[PDB]
Amino acid sequence: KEMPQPKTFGELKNLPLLNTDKPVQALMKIADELGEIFKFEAPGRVTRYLSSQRLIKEACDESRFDKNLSQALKFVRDFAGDGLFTSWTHEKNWKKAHNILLPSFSQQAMKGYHAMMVDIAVQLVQKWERLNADEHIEVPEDMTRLTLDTIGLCGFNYRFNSFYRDQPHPFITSMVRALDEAMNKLNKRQFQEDIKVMNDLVDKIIADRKASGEQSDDLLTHMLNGKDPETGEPLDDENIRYQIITFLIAGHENTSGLLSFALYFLVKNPHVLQKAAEEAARVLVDPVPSYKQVKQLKYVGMVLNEALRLWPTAPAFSLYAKEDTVLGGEYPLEKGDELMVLIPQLHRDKTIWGDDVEEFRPERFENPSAIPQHAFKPFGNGQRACIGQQFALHEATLVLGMMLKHFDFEDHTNYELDIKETLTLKPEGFVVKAKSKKIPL
Ligand code: HEM
């Protein structure tokens, strides 16, 4: 009935508790200690962190709670604007973009993006094939090159050519610096210059495409051709720009983290790596994988879900109460009160998953129906769930499948997991050696 709360520091309230490089990891320890719900205050502000499936299922009731723009999302809005990720649900442009873009992100739509995903995946595998004996792989670094380039190509048919560079394309450098700055705020001159570098490139590409009239298999074509069924209006060019920025911003780091954490768990669990590699070998019988083959990589799909269980790479989302309501028969909330869903803790709820929650066991997902509703939420909730979910999973399944077909892997440093936190999670300094199986690529 009365809510637990961690240590306060006078007027600073709980804020100093998050004065750390790893705040989600600190929050998980507070959840370990305090249980399924705790109050957390800062000077301007109050939230409640939820960790149990029992309470989070109620928080996922869209008649009662809607997505909140957290402080992080308000800072990111300085360059992401009213794109899908940083808009309120009742903003006109949220509904308009959601209606136009939804079918373009369906599983069916992945058939159209597949060729460009494969173009970048082959670049990754060729890079590793071309390493000499004395060399290792920087895993998150290379996964980030891959996901950035894939979203650039599928998003607006632009090649960042990350596998041709030590220093990223200047748009990437500006984007990464811009995110870092907004996360650090939780400079001003540089922030503005980086916003400008981002808008100018994206605005140019939109302008070039409208001029040529070329039709391609990318999201920019769908957005130029789209009309909202409700209002009948297309997106304007400004909003199209914010969406392109958002796909890069919302998508690249989470998908790179997922691939990195999956490879981490596979090298730490060689029996699981072997079962996954055996599937990859049986299924991916052609030098270039087909869309239908990726669909047949069931166990690789399970590996990815179990990596998302333990370390969901967008680990928290924020909600507000639409009206006064009582949570779990115990905790009265007022209209506008905010809740945070602490996804890594939810995914450790022993009442759902059994006592072995820290173990990496992809077989938990053998029968996707046996997972209770709202027990597994790495892509958020309801109409404000990740629009990129099918894209992320097709990309990750394709690339992991190819990695497992083409190489044997060695954890040559006996790497110790260190999770770096920004807007996303990543296994910092994770490195491996890959020995080629010398299979036609
Ligand atoms: C494993 C990779 C990914 C994870 C774990 C992930 C996670 C999430 C989560 C938890 C949300 C909800 C945020 C909130 O409630 O505040 C979200 C929203 C969103 N994501 Fe993803 N994401 C991933 C990949 C992608 C990719 C590849 C794209 C684009 C190509 C993308 C685009 C978006 C967009 C536009 C939204 C906002 C949707 C809306 O509210 O209409 N994400 N993501």
Curated annotation (Swiss-Prot):
Outcome of substituting A314V: Substrate binding affinity increases 5-10 fold and the turnover number increases 2-8-fold for palmitate as substrate compared to the wild-type
Effect seen on changing A250M: No effective fatty acid oxidation. No effect on electron transport from NADPH to FMN. Slightly lower high-spin conversion with arachidonate, palmitoleate, palmitate, myristate and laurate/dodecanoate
Broad class of the protein's primary localization: cytoplasm
Top-level division of the source organism's lineage: Bacteria
Outcome of substituting F379H: High substrate-free turnover rate constant. Negligible substrate-induced spin-state and substrate-induced heme reduction-potential shifts on addition of saturating concentrations of arachidonate
Residues that hold heme according to the record: C386
Site annotation Important for catalytic activity: residues: N254
Keyword tags: Cytoplasm, Electron transport, FAD, Flavoprotein, FMN, Heme, Iron, Metal-binding, Monooxygenase, Multifunctional enzyme, NADP, Oxidoreductase, Transport
Keyword Flavoprotein found: yes
Positions contributing to (9Z)-hexadecenoate binding: Y49
Signals that turn on the gene: By pentobarbital. Expression is negatively regulated by repressor bm3R1 at the transcriptional level.
Protein name (Swiss-Prot/TrEMBL): Bifunctional cytochrome P450/NADPH--P450 reductase
Species, as recorded: Priestia megaterium (strain ATCC 14581 / DSM 32 / CCUG 1817 / JCM 2506 / NBRC 15308 / NCIMB 9376 / NCTC 10342 / NRRL B-14308 / VKM B-512 / Ford 19) (Bacillus megaterium)
Complete-protein stretch covered: 4 to 456 of 1049
